[PDB]
Amino acid sequence: DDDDKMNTAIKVIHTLKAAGFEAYIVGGAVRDLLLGKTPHDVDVASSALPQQVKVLFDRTVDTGIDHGTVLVLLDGEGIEVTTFRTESVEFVLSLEEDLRRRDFTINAMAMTEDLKIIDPFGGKEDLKNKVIRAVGDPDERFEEDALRMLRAIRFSGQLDFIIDMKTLLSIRRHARLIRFIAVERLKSEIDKIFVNPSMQKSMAYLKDSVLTRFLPVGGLFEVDWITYHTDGNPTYGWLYLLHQQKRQFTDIKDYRFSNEEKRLIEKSLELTALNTWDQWTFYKYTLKQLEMASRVTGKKKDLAAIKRQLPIQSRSELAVDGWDLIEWSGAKSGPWLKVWIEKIERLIVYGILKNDKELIKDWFEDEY
Ligand SMILES: Nc1ccn([C@@H]2O[C@H](COP(=O)(O)CP(=O)(O)OP(=O)(O)O)[C@@H](O)[C@H]2O)c(=O)n1
């Protein structure tokens, strides 16, 4: 491989310890190393306080300082250094105090500079058995942050693990608490589930855990997911969900999509409702919308080639505009222009009228 994150984190730990502080790799990096995977991120936990970290490193980003977190920039990587803490934020004085309030045992391990695993809650055994289990009392972990309930669902698909039975029954009992979680955090976890492996298992856990009873419009996630295959874009999960149920975008708008996301969903839904697609269809809709609609209805056409082979790609290529029509018509500017521009546009897109000012003028003077 060519990873640098672990190496950089080792250097960060070394500098922290050279200055008298304790420092360890924590979080998913430890889980990933034990799974033989290359970590996406490597967090460091330290007895150093944020301003003490800033003294030791030339380049830091300080946005999370209130939470105890300094981002250390080193060797072209960024390592998050967080003081021992628990969230609710309270700084604490030992590693174990920090670890004992984390969500799941596989996420509550630490590793030293010398590769020793500190695993007070059996993270290694659960990792080996492929079990997502809350640290300590699950009722406690889920009251501290109800989003953890949904995180457990997400990890089951992402790692192909099961959810520990006691933990899962705890989620069932506290699923109501999900109502307090910012919808942006909910959407972020669901977007991950939609692109992760084993997503059908994640969706069955979502239902079995009772989360679908209390998530915003939670019942809508209970569709048949067998024929869903992610395209790497979480948006396709939301469109698949709606299409399977013959529902419209407004039914999921609680999740606070961006305008472009919403447009992509709404336009794709339109395409799936349109009986037959022709040149104007391929002209007016984006490739991304055409491809997502094709994906969700099961078509496999070579969409890109059809769009590319149209006479023009967009309105900016049109050889005529409203002010040419004002000249030829002798009429004052008004909404009629858009009507007539579109007539001309259609004729060009269907390859009937040449995209040529003088020939469009001929057509117009004859039609008007
Ligand atoms: N609610 C939470 C959120 C986080 N944590 C703890 O913070 C660490 C970093 O999570 P993180 O959010 O920074 C990345 P993660 O979500 O684990 O996915 P990835 O590693 O596959 O990229 C996790 O390992 C948990 O121990 C927690 O105890 N309760």
Residue numbers in the entry: -4 to 83, 94 to 373
Extract from the study:
Recently, we could show that the CCA-adding enzyme from Planococcus halocryophilus (PhaCCA), a bacterium from the arctic permafrost growing at –15 °C, is such a cold-adapted enzyme and catalyzes CCA-addition in vitro down to 0 °C. Interestingly, both the N–terminal catalytic core as well as the C-terminal tRNA–binding region are adapted to the cold, indicating that the psychrophilic features are not restricted to a single protein domain, but are distributed over the whole enzyme. Our results reveal that a combination of individual strategies – a global flexibility in the tRNA-binding C-terminus as well as a thermal adaptation in the highly conserved catalytic core motif C controlling interdomain movements during CCA-addition – contribute to the remarkable cold adaptation of this unusual RNA polymerase.
An ensemble of five structures was determined under cryoconditions, in apo state or in complex with a substrate in the presence of various salts. When the PhaCCA crystals were soaked with CTP or a non-hydrolyzable CTP analog, the diffraction patterns of the resulting co–crystals revealed an orientation of the bound nucleotide that is identical to that found in the corresponding GstCCA/CTP structure. Hence, the shape of the nucleotide binding pocket with the base-recognizing residues EDxxR of motif D does not differ between the thermophilic and the psychrophilic enzymes, excluding a prominent role in temperature adaptation.
